[PDB]
């Protein structure tokens, strides 16, 4: 059987229809039908597959049935394997889709494919069987194996079949499927983040000492010294001169460290503003180094927004709107700019000012914070960062156990000790924040032990306590209950709840840890993507940049490369061979598995004792 | 025999050498400023310094101890861990002190001033030194305070802090504490055990590696610990101008007998090897497989011939 020559487009609208009519796929084909039809043979066309593939995919199925709006029925598919895999898949077949992953010519680009289809199924599953079985689909694993055969064989091809367009994807590249796929264990593979890491140091050489890397920055003549390594591949030599100082100042680490050591001196700037150069308002006018820190602000405003919109040509504004108010730090972001508008309008009025000033205190604070997200792409630390906003979670858990041992505690002692202090303020005050600082060491029981209550000059009146012309006297009515109270709610915050916190910690780490490390590598990657396109110079003169830029489109990418077409086509039958032995190590290792071995041995002895039993008759006979 | 640059590198190259290069470097500092009288306070302080810097080395003199040792090199480890923790803690303490400072003290002119109450007081707002009589209104005493800024730069009176919007700054307190004294410290005891766990096995087997070396360093010592190593010094000294248990050399008959015997001993564990893998369950089931297939086509053909005849 000749599946070239078998599978049409109208056998493959015949099996697309002739569906279980018991799995999701039929759903999701009838509410696609009924949309359509609610719009405006066969039961399902392949508009219905198509959007159903636009919910799951949503970029790689374009053009793959609407080219020709639908094609002729007798012609043969161009991907017959692909689209094979991707109706064996849309409907949980699992074993008859792995049989066609075995035969299609991209192996990786369909493996991640899979994954995102079965991890995006099951959610829509109904039975607990089915989404158990959607849940672990291991194609991820396959795609990982495959590529550790791969790198392991060539790992110079292993990158050109990364970074390649692939052909049976709508020209996708398999990086940009395992971004589509989230496949977070397939960023992690070696081959990968050696990729990356590649692209991460640019020309220079991978095992550039960072000690020599910054020091070069430091001082920039030394580029053109020997003190870094670089990789391979009078005018003249002043081209020369250029195109080295290019390639150091263009690598993505040389970018990111300077961007670093500017966002360093925009918080040092911002500090001093803040701190020592706040003037009066216009009137007296801003300072000189007030006005700079408006500019820079300004500049990273624009780099922010040129970074969330202008990278995309292709794509809804309200689309890359909703993708950039997901991220939580892109909602810090906001929070920081629009703390800074609002306080640079405030610090312009005079009845605002302190109102301004405050605002922008607040502002520094949130920046501050921001530079973690800057530092997120350090080797050392990103780790710890993902491993921190795993650990807010037991953080809340305590601090709702906190919350409500430390309102009963506060309340009743409140009420034991000051029962006629009608100020709201010194109520909350003496209720959350005195037993908020009990945590802290800071026990003051000059105001709850009647042994240790100074002689304060001190009323009872209700009128003479709300003026705050003398202290309220504490009531000693009862204090051995207080004082007992208080040892009670010592012992049980300072040593059950901080004890607690530290066990749920070292569980947290201990768990977390593996998986922090593969979210970090994933990160790693977006990151790296993103400082590949980012300008060389950091703000507040990355408006030199902007400007050039503007100035280049008004007049007139080493990752996801379209490659020649003999090339395509070798790297093509070099995977799929890599495929194949892997396939063939597979049922080799199963083979000589001490399980199968001792299988076969059972049923070749069965044999042997029913003919040998048969033969000792015969000779019995003679 | 070896080249003097070669042995200052390999010298330096030690993070303990490079203490006690700087140990001697403050003495020598110190002495020759203590000699002046213009400069002798600095000199005290230098030893003053140097004295920390001795009782430091004191740690390296004690690694070869058994018990110590493995302490010594967890400890190293776990400086990594140390230092992860301080960069966290040193981004969220230059936010809220910075924070707290401007919205505190917006008129205090004095740089000094403004690095204590920006990273002094929230460094030590963990160790629970929380001075609330500065930060809290309601706690602020009645001192005799001035906002003149001629005034606040003499020091003639201090700074009156601002309270235009206190609450602010409690609740950033507030936040600042649980954060640090609840978060950073338990993410940093977590890291602390799991680290000790992870490195126990590989600091054992470190320090019996640097074992090794402190005893073959110990066996060349002399005698007599100083001040009056001295003696054993000008001894040596004498000794050499008028004229090894470990790495010994062995007759030629005892070396020949050994290498033979090293031999044997080297046969007879490949020899274990070889038979343990023999006995193996895996190998058994192979073999076992293997001659059930050649037992059952050998069978099958007797089989076919018995029922010929
Ligand atoms: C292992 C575990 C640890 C926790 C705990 O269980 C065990 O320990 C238990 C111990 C217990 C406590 C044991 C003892 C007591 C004392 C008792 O008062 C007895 C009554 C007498 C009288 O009526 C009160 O006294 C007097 O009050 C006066 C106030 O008008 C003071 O006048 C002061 O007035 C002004 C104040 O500046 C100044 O002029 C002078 O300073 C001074 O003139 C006197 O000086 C003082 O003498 C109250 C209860 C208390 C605190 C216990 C509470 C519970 C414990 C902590 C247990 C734990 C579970
Ligand atoms: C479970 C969790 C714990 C943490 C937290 O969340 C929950 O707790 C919350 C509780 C909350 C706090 C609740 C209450 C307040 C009070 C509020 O002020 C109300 C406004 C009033 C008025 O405008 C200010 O008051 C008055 O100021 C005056 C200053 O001029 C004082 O004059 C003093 O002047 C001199 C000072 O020596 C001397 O002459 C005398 O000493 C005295 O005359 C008055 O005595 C005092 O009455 C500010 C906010 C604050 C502190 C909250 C902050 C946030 C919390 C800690 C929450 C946590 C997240
Ligand atoms: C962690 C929560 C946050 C929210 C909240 O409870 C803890 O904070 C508390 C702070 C309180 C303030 C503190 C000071 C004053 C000044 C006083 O003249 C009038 C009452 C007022 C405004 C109080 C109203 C009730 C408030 C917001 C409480 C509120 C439930
Ligand atoms: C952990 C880092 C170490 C380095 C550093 O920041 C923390 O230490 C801080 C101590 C500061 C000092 C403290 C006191 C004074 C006295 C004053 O009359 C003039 C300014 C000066 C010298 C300050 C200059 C800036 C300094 C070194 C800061 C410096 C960034
Ligand atoms: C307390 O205040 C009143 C106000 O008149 C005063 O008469 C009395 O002497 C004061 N006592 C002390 C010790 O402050
Ligand atoms: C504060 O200092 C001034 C200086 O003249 C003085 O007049 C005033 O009485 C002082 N007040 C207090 C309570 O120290």
Redesign the pocket.
Known sequence: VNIKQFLTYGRLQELYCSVSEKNLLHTLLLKKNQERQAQLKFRFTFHEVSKVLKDFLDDTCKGFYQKLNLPDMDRRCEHPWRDLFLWAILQNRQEMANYFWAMGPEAVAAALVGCKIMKEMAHLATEAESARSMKNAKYEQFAMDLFSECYSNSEDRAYSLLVRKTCCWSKATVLNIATLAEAKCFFAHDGVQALLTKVWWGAMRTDTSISRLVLTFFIPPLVWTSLIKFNPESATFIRVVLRRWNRFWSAPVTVFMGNVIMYFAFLILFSYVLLLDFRPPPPYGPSAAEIILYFWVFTLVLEEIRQSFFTDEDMSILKKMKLYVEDNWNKCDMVAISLFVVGLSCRMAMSTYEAGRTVLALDFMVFTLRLIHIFAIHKQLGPKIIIVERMIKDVFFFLFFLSVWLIAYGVTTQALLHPNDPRIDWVFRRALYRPYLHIFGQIPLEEI???????DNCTTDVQEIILGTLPPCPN?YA??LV??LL??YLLVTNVLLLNLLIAMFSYTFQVVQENADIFWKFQRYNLIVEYHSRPALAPPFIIISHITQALLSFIKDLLERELPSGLDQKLMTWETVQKENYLAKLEHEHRESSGERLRYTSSKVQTLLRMVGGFKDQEKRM
Do not use: E, G, R
Request: no cysteine.
């Open positions: 032990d009647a042994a240790k209550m100074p002689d000693i204090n051995w004082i007992l040892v009670i």
